[PDB]
Structure 1
Amino acid sequence: ETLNGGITDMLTELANFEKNVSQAIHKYNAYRKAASVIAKYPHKIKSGAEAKKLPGVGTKIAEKIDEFLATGKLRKLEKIRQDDTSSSINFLTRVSGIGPSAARKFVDEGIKTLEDLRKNEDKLNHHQRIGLKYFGDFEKRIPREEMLQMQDIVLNEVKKVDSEYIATVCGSFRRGAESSGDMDVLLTHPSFTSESTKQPKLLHQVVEQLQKVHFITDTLSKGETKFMGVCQLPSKNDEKEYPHRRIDIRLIPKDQYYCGVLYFTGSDIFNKNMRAHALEKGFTINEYTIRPLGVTGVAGEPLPVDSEKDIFDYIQWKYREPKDRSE
């Protein structure tokens, strides 16, 4: 956690670049298990060979550790931080809609910067476009003070459209958090469930309403269950307009809402621990359900949940306020 930090960090840089710049997934994948194991390792790595000793650690990685250990740096790492081509792919990727794949193409094309991007607004697709238009805004964190306003509006409008709508803003925003990055709404409706064959409208009506009143600004991707958008808090009395904010809404069958709710609220760490315990207790839990673990190895069947309460209870746990859902 700090004894083998830089090692695990360099390893991380290495893995990353393998993937993003070159295409070396195996390689990339290599740096990763390595950094994981070294990460878990209880002693101070004092040398290459010492490490090598570990699983995942081989020759080439050891090689590197040595150098890194021997001196405060790593040539390759140093060469990678200069190389503009590398650098670009890191940058270009910054744009919502621009993954690595794409980052490579543009670069081979010459588009390396934001301007490059503007001038070439043709080569970009819709998402990529919005991405570009809201670059700065996109990167701005969302202070909860705005989160509440948002949340305010969202829930009021969802309500108007149908009283049976159950919406919930998960995320860290849900776990206390002073600021978030994006806004994720979990949505279900009584008339939506596991068997119940579809009902697209269920998600479309609200989307509409949102944009009706202007909270939703653009559409990123909009399917039958997931909608990816842009939204914004109505600029008050002109002088201070809001930034554009990422937002996602998703329809879930009412019969697997809280698992998800729980699920989405996190943290990952809370999840695990709960997941592990769930297992002791003789159960299993995932994004959508909780199930009684048979003995034959495994086994299924959905347990019937009506709140995050029903879940814990099951695992015979202490109900945890979302704030203390941390770890």
Structure 2
Amino acid sequence: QDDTSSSINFLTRVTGIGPSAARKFVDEGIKTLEDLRKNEDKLNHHQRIGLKYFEDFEKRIPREEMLQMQDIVLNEIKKVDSEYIATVCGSFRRGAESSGDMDVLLTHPNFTSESSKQPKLLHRVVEQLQKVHFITDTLSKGETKFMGVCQLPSEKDGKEYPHRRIDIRLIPKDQYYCGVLYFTGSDIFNKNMRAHALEKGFTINEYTIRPLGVTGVAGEPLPVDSEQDIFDYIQWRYREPKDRSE
């Protein structure tokens, strides 16, 4: 069993291959990266691109590169429409010295929670980033979420940076800063802040902050025009992201 398990665990390191699909591959004698490459016909698109960048996707991103990536993303988005608002979240926003991926939250005042889908608000940004060769591949592209691959431009002698995972999520403007709060984390900090909100008569989720009565009925979403507004409602001092480990 040891070798069977090691094979399954190996394939799960490919993005797009989860434990169940890995078990099915190994049952078919597909166990290594070489086996996967010889059996590209059995892969979906996400798995094929994850195999393509297997080694790169096991490398971390130094904060220095994250800052370069951030400027490319922010500068190109502003070129498409200066009314877009985009924020890099995750442990990067909390000041982490390295990141596993880049997670971008995107909004636009044309897109509110009363809106039906506006996928081209997302796709136009993806297309511009592809046009300047920053986004290199797509893992999946939906009406509000893009998961793909990017790469910093070569700086010297044609030497290449590793390809990196990037996600871009389109969020309604009236829910944007609650989203930024949630996706900045940490998970423990989010739990602690939601517990304090309850003590103060509010309930916070990924989308909204609402007043919460003694019977447990949530009221209407409160207006939020900055992350600071959410802390103001629950009477907490603003917690800078570097202070959100717990």
Deviations 1:225-255 (A, max 9, x none): 0000000001112253110100000100000
Q: Give me the whole-angstrom Cα distance separating, in 1, the residues matched to 2:8 and 2:65.
A: 32
Higher relative contact order (CA 8 A, sep 6+): 2
Kept after mapping to 1: 8 A contact 2:203/2:218: no
Identity %: 96
Largest Rg, 1 or 2: 1
- Cα offset, 1:297, TM superposition: 2.7
Which deviations, in whole Å up to 9, do the C-alpha atoms of 1:132-160 show, x marking residues without a partner?
Answer: 11010001001010000000100000000
CA-to-partner distance for each residue in 1:37-63, whole Å, 9 max, x for gaps? xxxxxxxxxxxxxxxxxxxxxxxxxxx
Displacement of 1:116 in angstroms is: 1.1
Distance in structure 2 (CA, Å) of the matches to 1:89 and 1:302 = 46
Q: Any unmatched runs of 5+ in structure 1?
A: 1-81
Shift of the alpha carbon at 1:120? 1.2
Greater CA drift, 84-93 or 207-216: 84-93
Task: Tell me the residue number matched to 2:49.
Answer: 130
What is the rounded CA distance, in whole Å, between the counterparts of 2:237 and 2:24 in structure 1?
A: 52
Alignment gaps of 5+ in structure 2? none
CA distance in 2, matches of 1:286, 1:97: 28
Structure 1 counterpart SS, 2:16: coil
Name the residue aligned to 1:254.
173
Contact 2:144 2:171 in 1 (8 A): yes
Contact 2:134 2:153 in 1 (8 A): yes
Any conservation in 1 of the 2:211–2:218 contact (CA below 8 Å)?
yes
Report how far residue 186 of structure 1 moved.
0.2
Give the alignment's Cα RMSD to 1 decimal. 1.0
TM-score (norm 2): 0.98
94-103 or 238-247: which moved more? 238-247
Cα distance, 1:308 vs structure 2: 1.0
- Deviation for aligned residue 1:121: 1.5
For 1:100 and 1:110, the matched residues in 2 are separated by 15
**Cα displacement (A) at 1:296:** 2.0
Residue 196 of structure 1: how far off its partner (Å): 2.2
State TM-score, norm by structure 1: 0.74
Alignment deviations for residues 10-38 of structure 1 (CA, whole Å, 9 cap, x no partner): xxxxxxxxxxxxxxxxxxxxxxxxxxxxx
